[PDB]
Design a protein around this nucleic acid. Structure first.
Length: 133
DNA sequence: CGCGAATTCGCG
DNA sequence: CGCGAATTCGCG
């Protein structure tokens, strides 16, 4: 019960905390729909949070009914809660990723959306299509 | 229950 | 040199 007509998001990490990047792809074709170049310091959960909100914004702009898949139960919970509960220290090194997460929380607090946000079940369906690698 | 101090899980 | 959010037991 995979919905092939969907958007898959995934985060790539080199260290956690460490360099993080993300992208969103068409689950069927693998076409890259958006991508964010590496941010020097973040966490996987913060990058997944930003990836899903970027996906929500991308689909909303297009009036799309496609769902979003993410392999991160944590980040899905944070998006539904409209609050990213990261433990990453707030300092000048982490200012960029915190700014982007604070703004993504603000976007969720000021917009509505209909997009279903679904867990990708890696142990049945293999690697999420947006995977890095 | 109120809490500590463990283990587990999926992920990169 | 892990992140977060589950659990499980201990011992009240």
């Amino acid at each position: 019960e995979i919905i092939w007509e969907s958007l898959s998001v995934d985060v790539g990490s080199q260290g956690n905390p460490g360099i993080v990047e993300y992208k969103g792809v068409d689950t069927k074709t693998g076409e890259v729909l958006f991508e964010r170049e590496p941010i020097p310091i973040g966490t996987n959960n913060m990058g997944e949070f930003l990836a899903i909100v970027h996906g929500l914004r991308y689909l909303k702009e297009r009036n799309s009914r496609k769902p979003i898949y993410s392999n991160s139960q944590t980040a899905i919970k944070w998006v539904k809660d409209k609050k990213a509960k990261s433990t990453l220290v707030r300092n000048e090194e982490t200012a960029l990723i915190w700014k982007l997460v604070d703004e993504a929380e603000e976007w969720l607090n000021t917009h509505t959306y209909e997009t279903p946000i679904l867990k990708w079940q890696t142990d049945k369906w293999g690697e999420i299509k947006a995977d890095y690698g």
